[PDB]
Design a protein around this nucleic acid. Structure first.
Lengths: 145, 117, 109, 101, 56, 138
RNA sequence: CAGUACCGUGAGGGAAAGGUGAAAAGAACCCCGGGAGGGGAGUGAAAUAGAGCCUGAAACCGUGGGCUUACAAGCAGUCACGGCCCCGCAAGGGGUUGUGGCGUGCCUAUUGAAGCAUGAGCCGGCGACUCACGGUCGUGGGCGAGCUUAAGCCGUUGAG
RNA sequence: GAGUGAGGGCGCGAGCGAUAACGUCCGCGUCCGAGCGCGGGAACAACCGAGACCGCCAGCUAAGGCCCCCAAGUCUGGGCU
RNA sequence: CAGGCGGUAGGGGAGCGUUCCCGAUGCCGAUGAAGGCCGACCCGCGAGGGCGGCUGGAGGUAAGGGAAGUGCGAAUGCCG
């Protein structure tokens, strides 16, 4: 704060000791380093970006996985109709699920995917699947060789 | 992420407040003060534990020697009158059978003593 | 039921106290008079007080003079106005001014 | 009339069928009629004889009707910043019902 | 000189009980009802001696 | 929960004394008699006991050679002076007064010590006025 | 409505001070009346809703209540039988205290404390080793003679 | 992975000192400190005993005690004060 | 079941109390979140946790564990 730089007396002083106008004693003075924009940059690899979901879904297949690897629904751009294949398939907002659709097509379509996935590109979101269940894929190749 | 103070402390010292009701000076209106009594009152309440028992105890002791001297006999050796007997009991508290209906004790003299012949 | 007020003063609340315990437990008569005719501040005020008190309490509250007993009041204090005191070597001779407060009450006989 | 014996470092006496407390001791609720030994009686309307023990071939009908309850206490060190409490207390307490001998 | 502590309210009312307001006095009057105090003048009863305000 | 509180007592009464009572020596177990010795209901907190006296107490069992061999002094001075008096003195000054002291040395104390004392009639009668009992024990 | 009040001589230096409500709808009227500051009424879901008004604790306030007290000695509180006013049919639960017992506190220093060796206004409220990076022993692990890629580039709402 | 030498009281060996000090240096033993929580000690950490969560209107004994202010024979002698 | 248990610094075991995360297009919630005054029941050795009443006036975040400007009587401290 470029403080008034040094101030009061000594010996006597306002009884209370001091010299440094940094006064880290009030609700506006210096203190300590609690945060730091350094939200710390730690991480890992793909040598695990794999194994994880492996064992997970297996048991999530004992749940009811499946995944046409590529299925229609209709206008692939009109939300409703997509779900029309939700029912003509066997799903309904309850036990949650997700999926990978590498095409803008159903993307610029699935719009608001509550209780559901609506992916397309690739980032991987296992977690949210935890709060969900079943699912579908875009070719084993799309997942990654 | 941010964090402050708030209400925590007061509570921790409010406990005292409640336990302090009835005390005199600051000991009835202070966290560091009443705190400082939870120590006196505290330790002395508990502590006064051995105290309280140590009280009602010997209290028995005398009232006992008191009228036992009436019938004649007296403590120490008296207790013996019990030993030379055949067992030993009464928890000098029960020895209240002198408070209400003592001639009960009377025989007890005849008891203890008689072992010496 | 025979009541008024006693707040928003400019001075010493403890100086009132006994002025009331002086005329507590009495009756409308007692107080109104005696004290009204008793020097040393307080008077000129507690006065206008009792006038409005039972004036309405015997208005939009319908009471009865003469019988209105002197319940009591609420010996209490108020706010202040700040002003420091100069001195030798411009020291710290400081203060303000305690105003006063308290309550007004009598009843139906 | 009165009567007397004990219950583990605690000598008691009674009259008819009263009961309050004296810690806890095994044997389910008060569905049983448990009873130990004794020593004197009550020099009055019926007696006048203690002697060596007395609990020889003689006991006392101590009814049950359990009601075991968890009480409370309250501790803390206290000295010179060595008051390390963080520990109140309870203690046992059984509720049953006597009879006699 | 100078002390070093804080005042006690106990001693508060203690030494100040003798402050129990000692109320003034008063008496009757003649004509109307100017119940005046030991030697005074008021137009509530006027009087009948020297001559001040009014009487009836 | 045995208590012992009988709900009051109302102390006893008795009488005694003669040229053959060893002053002081007796004292001790004397008061230890009033408070409520024979008083079973004796709940140390309450103040029972009796109500006793000592007539022809003047000069009673002159004890031993305490005479001249003891200066009953406890009256502390103020400017630099208190009191003294030995045996061949007090023995004189209110014989009753005297005896009082001898014991006064040890005695009990507190709201209780005080009360159990109230009843301390003595002197050198015999015959204890304002009486209303006195089962004297030799 | 502060870089102001303000303190300065310059430089300089620096304050306090957000919160009625859905809507001011912001008080009509008439008896206290010095304007002030009152009571009613009304609006008003809400006046323990009205202008240092949000909700409003705490130090400091007694009205007024209840239990205490003028032989009396004390870190004071405690433990004890007892009595003394609310509540439970009962069991008791209470509040307080008589006396009796019992009682050297508290926060910092050191052969050595309670201590007139310091500090302690008082209550509230703010207050102190993360973390970066860097070094280095353990821990669930995976790979495991093998075991780990920066700075970018497509791409990432996001992610990658 | 941390304290660490600013210890001292007692007793003994022993040097200091006017067998001068609740002192100094060591040794050592010691326990206080760190056991100012017991108890005795009349009141007083370092001297003796005794080393610590419940409940106790429970009992046995060591230090240590039995006229008083509070506990248990003004016991028994048998003398000697 | 023998045992252990005072114990300054130090060094372990946890647990507890204390503000963002997803859970939060899940769930209480005006027959109330939240503050509170009160609670003399229950659960917590404790940490506390409750747990229910009356004043209280607009939101809360489950199990879980994932992050920590706190776990503040005080320093003749800052301030009010």
């Amino acid at each position: 704060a470029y403080s008034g730089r040094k101030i009061w007396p000594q010996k006597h002083t306002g009884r209370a000791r001091h010299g440094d106008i940094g006064a880290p004693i009030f609700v506006g003075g210096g203190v300590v380093f609690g945060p730091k924009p350094r939200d710390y940059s730690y991480t890992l690899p793909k040598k695990v970006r794999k194994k994880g979901l492996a064992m997970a879904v297996a048991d999530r297949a004992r749940e009811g996985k499946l995944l046409l690897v590529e299925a229609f629904a209709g206008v692939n751009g009109k939300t409703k109709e997509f779900l029309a294949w939700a029912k003509e398939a066997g799903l309904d907002g309850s036990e949650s699920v997700l999926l990978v659709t590498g095409n803008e097509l159903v993307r610029r379509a699935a719009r608001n995917l509550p209780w559901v996935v609506t992916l397309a590109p690739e980032g991987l979101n296992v977690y949210d699947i935890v709060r969900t269940e079943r699912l579908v894929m875009d070719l084993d190749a799309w997942e990654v060789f | 992420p941010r964090a402050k103070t708030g209400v925590v402390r007061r509570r921790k010292h409010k406990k005292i407040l409640k336990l302090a009701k009835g005390y005199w000076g600051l000991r009835s209106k202070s966290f560091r003060k009443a705190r400082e009594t939870l120590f006196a009152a505290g330790n002395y309440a508990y502590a006064h534990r051995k105290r309280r028992k140590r009280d009602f105890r010997r209290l028995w002791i005398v009232r006992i020697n008191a009228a036992c001297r009436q019938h004649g006999l007296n403590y120490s050796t008296f207790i013996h009158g019990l030993k030379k007997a055949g067992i030993e009991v009464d928890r000098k508290n029960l020895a209240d059978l002198a408070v209400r209906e003592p001639q009960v004790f009377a025989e007890l003299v005849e008891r203890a003593k008689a072992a010496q012949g | 039921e025979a009541k008024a007020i006693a707040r928003y003063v400019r001075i010493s609340p403890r100086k009132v106290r006994l002025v009331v315990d002086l005329i507590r437990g009495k009756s409308l008569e007692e107080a109104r008079n005696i004290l009204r005719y008793t020097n040393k501040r307080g008077a000129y005020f507690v006065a206008k007080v009792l006038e409005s008190a039972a004036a309405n309490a015997v208005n939009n509250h319908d009471m009865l003079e003469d019988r209105l007993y002197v319940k009591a009041a609420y010996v209490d204090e108020g706010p202040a106005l700040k002003r420091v005191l100069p001195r030798a070597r411009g020291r710290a001779d400081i203060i303000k001014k305690r105003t006063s407060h308290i309550t007004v009450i009598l009843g139906e006989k | 009339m009165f009567a007397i014996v004990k219950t583990g470092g605690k000598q008691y006496r009674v009259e008819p069928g009263l009961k309050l407390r004296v810690e806890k001791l095994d044997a389910e609720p008060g569905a049983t009629v448990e009873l130990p030994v004794l020593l004197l009686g009550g020099e009055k309307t019926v007696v006048g004889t203690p002697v060596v023990e007395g609990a020889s071939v003689v006991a006392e009908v101590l009814g049950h009707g359990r009601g075991k309850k968890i009480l409370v206490s309250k501790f803390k060190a206290k000295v010179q910043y060595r008051r390390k409490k963080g520990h109140r207390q309870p203690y046992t307490e059984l509720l049953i019902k006597e009879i006699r001998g | 000189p100078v002390p070093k502590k804080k005042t006690s309210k106990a001693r508060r009312d203690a030494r100040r009980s003798h402050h129990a307001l000692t109320p003034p006095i008063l008496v009757p009057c003649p004509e109307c009802k100017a119940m005046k105090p030991p030697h005074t003048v008021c137009p509530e009863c006027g009087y009948y001696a020297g001559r001040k305000v009014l009487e009836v | 929960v045995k208590t012992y509180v009988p709900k009051q007592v109302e102390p006893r009464w008795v009488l005694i004394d003669a040229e053959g009572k060893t002053l002081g020596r007796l004292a001790t177990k004397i008061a230890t008699l009033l408070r409520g010795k024979h008083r079973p209901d004796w709940t140390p907190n309450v103040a029972m006991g009796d109500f006793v006296v000592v007539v022809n107490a003047d000069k009673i069992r002159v004890t031993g050679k305490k005479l001249e061999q003891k200066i009953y002094t406890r009256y502390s001075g103020y400017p630099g002076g208190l009191k003294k008096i030995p045996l061949e003195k007090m023995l004189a000054t209110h014989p009753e007064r005297v005896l009082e002291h001898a014991v006064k040395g040890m005695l009990p104390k507190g709201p209780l010590g005080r009360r159990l004392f109230k009843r301390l009639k003595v002197y050198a009668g015999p015959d204890h006025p304002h009486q209303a009992q006195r089962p004297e024990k030799l």
